[PDB]
Amino acid sequence: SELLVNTKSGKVMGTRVPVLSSHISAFLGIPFAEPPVGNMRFRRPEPKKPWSGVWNASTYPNNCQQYVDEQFPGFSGSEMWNPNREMSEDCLYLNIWVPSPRPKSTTVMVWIYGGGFYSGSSTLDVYNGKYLAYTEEVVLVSLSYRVGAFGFLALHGSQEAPGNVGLLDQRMALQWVHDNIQFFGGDPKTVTIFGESAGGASVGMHILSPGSRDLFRRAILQSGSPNCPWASVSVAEGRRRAVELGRNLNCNLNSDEELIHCLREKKPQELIDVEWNVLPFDSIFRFSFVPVIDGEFFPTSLESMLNSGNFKKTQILLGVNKDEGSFFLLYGAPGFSKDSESKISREDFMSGVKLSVPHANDLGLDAVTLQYTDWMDDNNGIKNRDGLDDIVGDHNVICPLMHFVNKYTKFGNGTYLYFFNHRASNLVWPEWMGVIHGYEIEFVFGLPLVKELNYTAEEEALSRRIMHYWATFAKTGNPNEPHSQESKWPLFTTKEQKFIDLNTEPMKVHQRLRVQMCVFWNQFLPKLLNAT
Amino acid sequence: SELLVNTKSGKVMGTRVPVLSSHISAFLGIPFAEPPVGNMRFRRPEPKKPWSGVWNASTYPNNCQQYVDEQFPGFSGSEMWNPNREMSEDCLYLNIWVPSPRPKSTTVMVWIYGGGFYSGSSTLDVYNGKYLAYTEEVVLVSLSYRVGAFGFLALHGSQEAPGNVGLLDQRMALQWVHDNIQFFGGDPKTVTIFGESAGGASVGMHILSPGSRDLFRRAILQSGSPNCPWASVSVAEGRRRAVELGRNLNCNLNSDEELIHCLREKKPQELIDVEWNVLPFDSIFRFSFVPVIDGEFFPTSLESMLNSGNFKKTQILLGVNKDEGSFFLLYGAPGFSKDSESKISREDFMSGVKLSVPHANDLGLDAVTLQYTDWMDDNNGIKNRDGLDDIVGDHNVICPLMHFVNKYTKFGNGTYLYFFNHRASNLVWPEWMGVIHGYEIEFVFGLPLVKELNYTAEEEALSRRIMHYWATFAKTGNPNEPHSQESKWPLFTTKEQKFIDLNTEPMKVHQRLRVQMCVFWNQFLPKLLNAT
Numbered sequence A, B: 001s002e003l004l005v006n007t008k009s010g011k012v013m014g015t016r017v018p019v020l021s022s023h024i025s026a027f028l029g030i031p032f033a034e035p036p037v038g039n040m041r042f043r044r045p046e047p048k049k050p051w052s053g054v055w056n057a058s059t060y061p062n063n064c065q066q067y068v069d070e071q072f073p074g075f076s077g078s079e080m081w082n083p084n085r086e087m088s089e090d091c092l093y094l095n096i097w098v099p100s101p102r103p104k105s106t107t108v109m110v111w112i113y114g115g116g117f118y119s120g121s122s123t124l125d126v127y128n129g130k131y132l133a134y135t136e137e138v139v140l141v142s143l144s145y146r147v148g149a150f151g152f153l154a155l156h157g158s159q160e161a162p163g164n165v166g167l168l169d170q171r172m173a174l175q176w177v178h179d180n181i182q183f184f185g186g187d188p189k190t191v192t193i194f195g196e197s198a199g200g201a202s203v204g205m206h207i208l209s210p211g212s213r214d215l216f217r218r219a220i221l222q223s224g225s226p227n228c229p230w231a232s233v234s235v236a237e238g239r240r241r242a243v244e245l246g247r248n249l250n251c252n253l254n255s256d257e258e259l260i261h262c263l264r265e266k267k268p269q270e271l272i273d274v275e276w277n278v279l280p281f282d283s284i285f286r287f288s289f290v291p292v293i294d295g296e297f298f299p300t301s302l303e304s305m306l307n308s309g310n311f312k313k314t315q316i317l318l319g320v321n322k323d324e325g326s327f328f329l330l331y332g333a334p335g336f337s338k339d340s341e342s343k344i345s346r347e348d349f350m351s352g353v354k355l356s357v358p359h360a361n362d363l364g365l366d367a368v369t370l371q372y373t374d375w376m377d378d379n380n381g382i383k384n385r386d387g388l389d390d391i392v393g394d395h396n397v398i399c400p401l402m403h404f405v406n407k408y409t410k411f412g413n414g415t416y417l418y419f420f421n422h423r424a425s426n427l428v429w430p431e432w433m434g435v436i437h438g439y440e441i442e443f444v445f446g447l448p449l450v451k452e453l454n455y456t457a458e459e460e461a462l463s464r465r466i467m468h469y470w471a472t473f474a475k476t477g478n479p480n481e482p483h484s485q486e487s488k489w490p491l492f493t494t495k496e497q498k499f500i501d502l503n504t505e506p507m508k509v510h511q512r513l514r515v516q517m518c519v520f521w522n523q524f525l526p527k528l529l530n531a532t
């Protein structure tokens, strides 16, 4: 029986899942940490104490306690990223899609979801890995981690809640794969972690973190990098937020031991209802509880780690989507609506960029205003929303990642960089949002191969191109088959900075992605504010 | 007789000269002031004392002591701006061109020369007014002023060397025109001052100066403006270049009366030989002794004058050439040469930007650079050479002028704005220099009207078109004839900001001349350095 598999903790039984007129195996809801209930809340993950019997592993597990988006009640474009199982703090489980017949020792891809470190589920329809595992004969693994206060409350010096704890659940999931994937036909020597958004940030931090280097082989980062402004906070302010969350819910603040005991016999929606207020009095693409730079999970600041090359040297394949900031305007900024062109006055474009660069002084606001403004045309309603949506995209992902890539490439054994700019044919979201972040995921997981989903034939063609790039990268460390006649995706070299477009057309090679905007974001603006 | 004219200072007998198969009458080298020699060096002008007997005004006067340019001995492209008569401290003369028959209270146009306040001559061949006098039936005067230390050495607080005496020389000549032009057929109530570069900034400063405002009626500014960064210094810097002048010539510096005494025994070229040594910085496009913000000629700072509206309110007609920067780059910047295409290496580019913005700190240069560079193509000799021509042009001429235009227009009674971008077809300079600043002047004085200078038949029509714009501007305050016939030159209005091309192509209208760069140069960088 290929659906019964005896793991280092106990026996497991999956289920025969159908996929494209064929079937493949699925083991869903397998637990990798002891559930973090009660006193365990906020603590480092403990590995799952072994269990007797057969673990019915044929359903999806629960999701983690997290905010639930209700800006657009019953709107498929937004519900699709919300929890689809029940929520529980007993949520640390991983899923596995094995081909069948079961491979003897094959490549393993581990997916890490995004959701801003405040949300995310391993069980979304759009992360359902049966199509990629079967179509590409890889062993696919979805993991899950604590988010919000539950995984990222930081009180440095305390070991009852040290911070970066949600990152350690992904490491323990990772070590679980390194200990057990071999019995599902996985090769632990060829594990590929790959995430999107906060997932792609987490991949990059395992790249950085010494404790996680040896649990995976390569790395794929989509639309996210470890040095994104929103993906980390320094230890001080990290405490600060933990302690304003106390003031926000009538806690004791003469200690850490009771500031904490104060935050455990809460039930969980109580902390999510108030998760959102402790920020520097503005959101627009900043989230409550996120990884901390703690001198342990991260030995140093990230800038000096990438400077010294203090990280895992390997191959990475990474990229962004074109329009990475439309979601955050839509849900925050003035005069962005799902049901207008969201053309935008100049007056509310200025207030855009004051939101969009949280920290900026008076002179920083004037800089950023000046590089995104067509001063022959300053109340042009479209160029102004297009402009400001580029500020949030450029500043929060695209240019942060291009920093990561230029610094990385100087040390690793290969980089591949993509620019994903295909607006999907069935996208429920408004046109003006362009190629939103998140809607290349549906192509990585072969969803266009399901024809009841009314994708075009050229999008089945493109998801197959992308899946083979992704899986071949996971096997060979290189997106392309050699011995091949298709157009080759050039290595990103520290000199020429080549990259590719991913879309329905035959492929193209561009040099230096978004240089002009990223010279301003990464080299010149940092110096303007450093300046007294 | 006709050439015998009796002035408020005595009789002048001028000469009858040929102009384009016809003849008009010139009065050359009339003295409007007493020789500024001996103990009267650095002293304010004195009115020329009346002369008994006739003044033989048949030949051009002397030229004021200058630095003479000699990078290219023999090169007509440079020689045409060197003094073409004996140099002498006794040099305050003005020349008058009178059409024939002598008219009856007709329009007066006074010309002030440029030369960076260190040079210039009324006697050059491109300032020969006989063509404009003749074809537009106006009276053309060209004045003169002491240049360099002789005109602008300033120890504010002494009355022996107060500074701006060189501007007082121009005013003294304006007063001469106000008191005697009627006796040549001129109308003292319809006097137009105009000038190029430092001559243009000078008409700008008579607009500001309350002691000058009643001596003329309108004003034409060519490629210069009072607020230009090379056009003024403070009482404190002017003093300190005065004392360093003395120090270079081992002068006693215990006081002014000692220092000023010590500097008047020196042969004139003794100052000229050390004039450039007192510039505070290695720089292109700065000159040593320039008009000072002293509190008399200029009541207060030029910005607050332009702000409160404290200036002469009338019509102005003004503009810029396409490529102001080119001249100075050839002379002072590296990689630039007269005989190659002057492709600039990136390393040589950064050298050039530090010389163009010499008062700028480290953050200020990274600002200038990031704004003029294509980072997709940063080693493209052309795009660096051309970009640097644009930095020097916009920093020093183009965007000082628009700042002046915008501020004046709130109170003035009419503004016409031109962008001169025709490169003369007989130009002897390389083409990478484009429209050299100053080579509009051939067209204002009508030199294409003579066929031996081998101009183009369409450049003749441009010069008649221009001369007529300048002349009916002088007469009526609008360069269009009310005979609603040709392309009308729109009013520059604070809202719509229209301006025009002048070239052989039929005339078109544009808006917001170089707006995107001037926002950087007038509103962003100044705020940068006031803060860093």
Ligand SMILES: O/N=C/c1nc(CCCCNc2c3c(nc4ccc(Cl)cc24)CCCC3)ccc1O
Pocket (backbone or CB within 6 Å): A067, A069, A276, A277, A282, A283, A284, A285, A328, A331, A332
């Ligand atoms: O960008 N949208 C931002 C945003 N939305 C809302 C919608 C209703 C509350 C839901 N809670 C929020 C969410 C988020 N940010 C927040 C930042 C601050 C605060 Cl008080 C709440 C936030 C981002 C993801 C969507 C949920 C309110 C304020 C916002 O400022």
Ligand SMILES: O/N=C/c1nc(CCCCNc2c3c(nc4ccc(Cl)cc24)CCCC3)ccc1O
Pocket (backbone or CB within 6 Å): B069, B070, B276, B277, B279, B282, B283, B284, B285, B286, B328, B329, B331, B332, B333
């Ligand atoms: O454009 N720069 C030109 C330039 N020519 C020279 C040649 C003769 C020595 C003094 N002559 C001048 C100096 C300067 N400005 C000048 C501008 C135009 C001209 Cl003809 C002369 C200038 C500034 C620095 C001090 C020296 C030296 C350095 C220069 O840089």
Ligand SMILES: *[C@@H]1O[C@H](CO)[C@@H](O)[C@H](O)[C@H]1NC(C)=O
Pocket (backbone or CB within 6 Å): A056, A058, A059
């Ligand atoms: C496992 O759970 C599923 C879900 O209800 C159920 O249908 C199935 O019978 C269970 N299998 C075993 C062996 O208990």
Ligand SMILES: *[C@@H]1O[C@H](CO)[C@@H](O)[C@H](O)[C@H]1NC(C)=O
Pocket (backbone or CB within 6 Å): A412, A413, A414
């Ligand atoms: C990868 O490493 C090998 C040896 O360790 C080296 O020879 C090869 O050139 C490297 N490739 C890249 C792209 O760095």
Ligand SMILES: *[C@@H]1O[C@H](CO)[C@@H](O)[C@H](O)[C@H]1NC(C)=O
Pocket (backbone or CB within 6 Å): B013, B056, B057, B058, B059
């Ligand atoms: C005026 O001066 C010129 C130049 O020296 C001379 O040739 C001419 O004869 C003079 N004319 C009179 C009338 O003195």
Ligand SMILES: *[C@@H]1O[C@H](CO)[C@@H](O)[C@H](O)[C@H]1NC(C)=O
Pocket (backbone or CB within 6 Å): B412, B413, B414, B415
């Ligand atoms: C100039 O002033 C007159 C009245 O003094 C006014 O009627 C006219 O419209 C003004 N024109 C401009 C261009 O300011």
Ligand SMILES: *[P@](=O)(OCC)N(C)C
Pocket (backbone or CB within 6 Å): A114, A115, A116, A117, A196, A197, A198, A199, A230
């Ligand atoms: P990602 O987690 O997007 C989900 C809202 N990130 C851009 C923070």
Ligand SMILES: *[P@](=O)(OCC)N(C)C
Pocket (backbone or CB within 6 Å): B114, B115, B116, B117, B196, B197, B198, B199, B230
């Ligand atoms: P101008 O007088 O031109 C002569 C070199 N200068 C721009 C100050």
Ligand SMILES: [Cl-]
Pocket (backbone or CB within 6 Å): A018, A019, A020, A021, A450
């Ligand atoms: Cl299916």
Ligand SMILES: [Cl-]
Pocket (backbone or CB within 6 Å): A280, A286, A358
């Ligand atoms: Cl922040």
Ligand SMILES: [Cl-]
Pocket (backbone or CB within 6 Å): A425, A456, A458, A459, A504
């Ligand atoms: Cl398509």
Ligand SMILES: [Cl-]
Pocket (backbone or CB within 6 Å): A136, A468, A471, A472
């Ligand atoms: Cl494959």
Ligand SMILES: [Cl-]
Pocket (backbone or CB within 6 Å): A478, A480, A481, A482, A488, A489
């Ligand atoms: Cl290859």
Ligand SMILES: [Cl-]
Pocket (backbone or CB within 6 Å): B322
């Ligand atoms: Cl131009």
Ligand SMILES: [Cl-]
Pocket (backbone or CB within 6 Å): B402, B403, B406, B518, B522
């Ligand atoms: Cl302005």
Ligand SMILES: [Cl-]
Pocket (backbone or CB within 6 Å): B409, B410, B493, B494, B495
């Ligand atoms: Cl107006």
